[PDB]
Structures are given as C-alpha cells and as structure tokens.
Amino acid sequence: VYPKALRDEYIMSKTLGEVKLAFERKTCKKVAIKINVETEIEILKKLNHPCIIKIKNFFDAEDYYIVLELMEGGELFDKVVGNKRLKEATCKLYFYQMLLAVQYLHENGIIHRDLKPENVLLSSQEEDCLIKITDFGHSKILTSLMRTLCGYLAPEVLVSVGTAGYNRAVDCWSLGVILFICLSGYPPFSEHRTQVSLKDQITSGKYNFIPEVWAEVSEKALDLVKKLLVVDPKARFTTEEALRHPWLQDEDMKRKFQDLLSEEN
C-alpha cells in the first residue's frame, strides 16, 4: 500500500520506528526514507550539520515519509553488540563527532532526549568513518520561567527556577553511557545479575564496574566517562566542556576526521 505521489519519484523497498530503503527514480542512487509527529519533521528540517541526518525531501499524508541521504555504515549499535567493544581510536573519533552534534543541538536550544548507539549512524562499513544521529521523534525545543518571573505563584514552581536550563544535561548523560559502552563493551547500568532497582541503581550513579576489561582503556578515557555520569545535572560535563577534556585533544582524531569531510565532496 503505497501513495501514488510517493512511488512516482522513488522505488520504496526493504526495511532498515523502523525506516525503509528506496532508490532515486532519476539517479539510481540509493537513499533511506523515514517511516508531536510534526515536531521531528520540523526539526529534521532545521537540522543542518555534518554529524546529523540531513533531509533531502518530505512527503506527508497517509503515512509519514522523510527521505534522507542514506548512511551505509548502519547503526553504531550493530558494530558494538555481543560485547564486541571497539578500539580507542574508533571511540575517540566516533564519540568526538557525537560530541559535536550533541553540542550543535544544545547550541540551537535543541535536546535529542534519546541518544543511543542505534540512533548513531555511520558513513561506510569501514571501522573509520563519520557518524550522524537520527530519530528526532523525542526531541524538544527549549522560555517559560520568564512567565513565572516578573509577577504570586506556587512554591514548587519558584524552586523550579533553580533547575531550569539544565534540561539538556540528559543528552550528556546518555552520551556518557554510549561512550562507556563503546569503550568497555558492557552496560554501565545493567539489571544483569547484581540486583537492586534500576531506578535505585541509575539514580545512585554507582555504575557496575569491571576492571578485568577496563584495564585496556586509556588513562584519560575512563576519567572522562566517569566525569560524564554524574547524578547531578549541574555538575555534569557540558557538551562544550567535554570537547575540551584531555582525551579529546587528539590531532589524530581531528586529522582522520577533518579530511573525512572532504571525502564527501
């Protein structure tokens, strides 16, 4: 069941919510088409950054279709499941780019709110490539406490003034996890074995640690992840602050990357 307007310009096919693959009926080049719903469309349209999915065209009605230049690399997930881990360089380079996107989002008062390896797509199958992020279905645009101010009011709201603004830290948190994962290979906060509620586990920040593997990582890498998973959003590394962190001061990361951009032209 395909709308007439759609099948006219493309050849919708397999499956990669879940998104489907199609061929540009004019160039024979392949692309992927996506399948509070206006939000993502409105945002994905505002999205204009290398490490972020870029839209090529849009078509609504029936069901929702957003075609974007396809990422061959697939999901970052696929590359780091079955506890397969990844090389420091891979991580640094990968994560580095994530940091750029997450930063560019926050800079535009945008929150992803759902950052995970799945939503981190790669350029080409190779272990070295560029990475973008998709699925902006949960995002939010942040502009309200101004109404509360200059005026009465209820207590809980007033106190809320001391928290407003740090609604973006959640992305840093998830980025920390995503990083932790790539570097280690295992979930920081896993309901595996251990015990104790996940809420009590994640809220405490006492991530499950296993040196038997964390002994191979860098001396600066772990210290970063550690400073990234802070239970206090106020003391949690800002997307900006992270980029300045030592483990991200790597000419290699910015040399195998600053050129991989020209590999697009």
Next chain:
Amino acid sequence: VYPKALRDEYIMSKTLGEVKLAFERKTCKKVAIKINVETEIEILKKLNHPCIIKIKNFFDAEDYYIVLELMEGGELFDKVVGNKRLKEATCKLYFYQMLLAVQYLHENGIIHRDLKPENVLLSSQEEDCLIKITDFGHSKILTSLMRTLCGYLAPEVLVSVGTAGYNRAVDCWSLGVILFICLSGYPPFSEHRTQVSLKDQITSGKYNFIPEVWAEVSEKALDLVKKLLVVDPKARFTTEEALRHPWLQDEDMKRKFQDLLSEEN
C-alpha cells in the same frame, strides 16, 4: 480596524489580555469577546461547566476574537480590592464554586495555572451570585513518563517519576491564596514592609499573618486556608479533598447556589 466578517454579526465597542464588549447584532443582547494561542481556543471549546466561561462562537485571523456569554458581575478582583474584604457567606459561596471549577478542570486533566480574583468573574452586581473563571491562555493539558518507563535514561528524569502527576496542585495553591485574600483582605505573601526575598518567603510558606483581622473569620475557614497553603504539593489539599472540608459543609452555600442555577434558565 475591524475585520469585515466580525462587524457583520456584532457591534464591537468598549473595553473590559484585555477583552472588549459587543452587542449581538440580531438580538440586541450584550456579550463579551476575547482579544500557544490555539490552546485557549481549543480548551475554551472543551469547557462545558457552569462555573466556567462558555463560548458562543469563534472567529480567527487578523486578531483573535472569542465571544462568550457576558458576565455582568465583572472581576472578583474589583469586589475585594482596597482591602475591602468580604463576608464569610460571600466567600464560602464564591470559593465553593471556584472549588467546583478547579475540580472539574483537574478531572479533565486540565490545569488553569493562573487562578486569581481577576480571572474569577461574577454573574450579577449583587453580593450573591454565581462565579466562573476565564483566561485559559496559560492552561495546560495533562502522559510522558510512560515513555520514560518500559525502557537507560538519565537520573534526574527517573527521580522525576516521584513528582509527576502533582502538576495540578499549583491551582489548589493559588486557590488558597485567592481564598485567603477574600477572607482576610490582604496578600498572604506580600513584599510589603516585612523583607526577605519573595522566593524565600513563598517557598517557606511562612505567610504574613495579622490576627487583628483574622479574628473575625470562622474557626474552620482559617484552618482550611492554612491546610491549603502547604509548601509540599504532595500534602497540599486536593481540589476534591477541599470540598469535603468542614467549612464547605454548608447547606446555605448549597441552597443559595443550587437555586441560583435555575436563575439562569
């Protein structure tokens, strides 16, 4: 500058944001027309309760016009400024109705978020009448923590689970103030004389008390207001709970009211 479609069916005139008065160009009967903007229109359309403004017709474009059956009584504010206070009966009857509206709103997962004497309109000039509430421009429709559950996540969000739901208590709080006012004649939390930040004043709940006037109120009335201005939204009287409170168990209040409805037919 009036749109052609508008002046066709009504005679827009004086001023009562601020709302203007107009005459039904078919019946010679008077009505008031109102002047995140779709929200109020969408909600005011869902509004179907005695103690709540009822819409008669809607017209958009240019500037925003929502015509509702006019309240002659005007603002509850007007009746209780200059520290003029009000009789216990007036309050009980008045506030009682407020409690009904605020309840009916919450029952429909609706929050007013801006309850003050101004936004409490009256039926007729008399000291005894029905009262509705308007200005739903700040309201909200409450459905999100379900997304957080059944799934990772950041700490602050998880803890947020222990607060979600009580976003409506703010209306009870303001109702308590509105009540306090009517009963006493003076603001519970006033930056007048005293000192100490309003945030530190309202957040503490230590309302400015003056017995030199609070000695005339009922023995149950004050106890209600007191139990209504609680710094903890979890222990703050629910709109439902309030109606059960002793000071609202008054056959008179429900006799001068249950009949004032038939005074509309």
